[model samples]
Target: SMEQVAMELRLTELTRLLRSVLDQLQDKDPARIFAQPVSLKEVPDYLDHIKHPMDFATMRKRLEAQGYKNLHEFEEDFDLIIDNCMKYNARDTVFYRAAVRLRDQGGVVLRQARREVDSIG
Candidate 1:
């Protein structure tokens, strides 16, 4: 159903930018590791290891709720997801490399989003 747009058109644009990063992340993760929360049953101590577990699916859900008050909050959530992966896995592991790779790509998206937002001001 086509509903009314919220009072926040800024978010309409901002949210669109955030979705690009999320889409990039989901596409890059072929194995779907970061797609969902860390499976505590599959990996021991994962819940405790990453006290604040962040994932793509979770971020997407939160975005649905308009969780981010501003772009900084949104950016921080994106960073935490990749940061947790890098910390949870060893530097030599593929997971870590993937985080590094995704981080770089996401950074570019965020920078462009920043420029786009600045231009609106």
Candidate 2:
């Protein structure tokens, strides 16, 4: 029961943090790309289904630096986030799969007409 509660709480927080990232991306062009594999409405379920070996605080700190101007930049930063998580024995496989699915679904490519801004601002 404790583990289940913990799992639910962690998923809640992770979903929150992830939605924050999506919010940051919303102002950019082609925003639809960011909401594909896990729509904002579906983040809680997506997070709940994933393996979460690390605590939210640590992941939150790292994810705070994840704003990006283009799909390439996002991919690079996301790759680092997933790599670091796995390198330290956090849940690597889960995120990797999720990211791959997202990429495949629609988040992988920068829109042909979109240009990379100097900053997200």
Candidate 3:
């Protein structure tokens, strides 16, 4: 129960942080910032194909090395990188949408796993 509660809180925090970051960039063109005309249905396959797993610790270290003073700064840079990648390439546009969906779905999977783990405990 405690672990599930903590997991839920962590997910909530992540959602809040993500929303804050996105809201800050609302003035930007959605077409340039996000993948266009893609379906959520494609996320699973995209996740499978995009096998690049996130190494948060390493990423954080790198961000710190690059003088990102806070999470907001890191998120801003992350969003900009995604925007740049998708802005020029049609294929990247679709892939970006799928990646975002996959990330959201991954959160769902994490919650489910937490539930199962807590039930066993």
Candidate 4:
């Protein structure tokens, strides 16, 4: 039942975490954020068993600069603080999805850092 529990916990945590991020972005001035609208391109990937689009280095670096030192740090400390708690394990599809997609998508547009910086300021 651990897998089931892990899945549930991850799903809830991922949703809450993403929602918080969205909330933060929403709180920002729209004009100050990225003007170019973006969409998620579904790649042939799953969460844990799925090979996602983006790579780990890109995700780790971006998150680190954005204040998250590491995935574990976020999962254990800040996530719970924000009521976004999750378990890291083999069944953690949500973790994989968020980490993968965030990096993948962020990398795609972030190469144009000027655009991102201009939009989010």
Best candidate, TM-score: 1
When 3 and 4 are scored with lDDT, the better candidate is: 3
What are the lDDT figures for the candidates, one per model?
0.78, 0.41, 0.44, 0.36
Q: 39-81 in candidate 1: lDDT tens per residue?
A: 8888878977787889888999988776765678887887888
* Residue 67 Cα positional deviation in candidate 2, in Å, after optimal superposition: 21
**Per-residue error at 113 for model 4, in Å?**
22
Q: Which is superior by lDDT, 1 or 2?
A: 1
User: Mind giving the per-residue lDDT tens digits that candidate 3 earns over 35-98?
Assistant: 2422338544544533332322333444434444334554544444444434433665664564
Candidate achieving higher TM-score, 1 or 4: 1
lDDT of 4 by residue, 1-121 (tens): 9998876655555444533443343233233222121113532223443222222233334443444432344333322211211222233555434434343444443244334333543
Model 1 regions more than 4 Å off: 1-7
Query: Candidate 4: global Cα-lDDT?
Result: 0.36
| Ten-residue region with minimum lDDT total, candidate 1 | 1-10
lDDT of 3: 0.44
TM-score per prediction, in order, is 0.82, 0.27, 0.30, 0.25
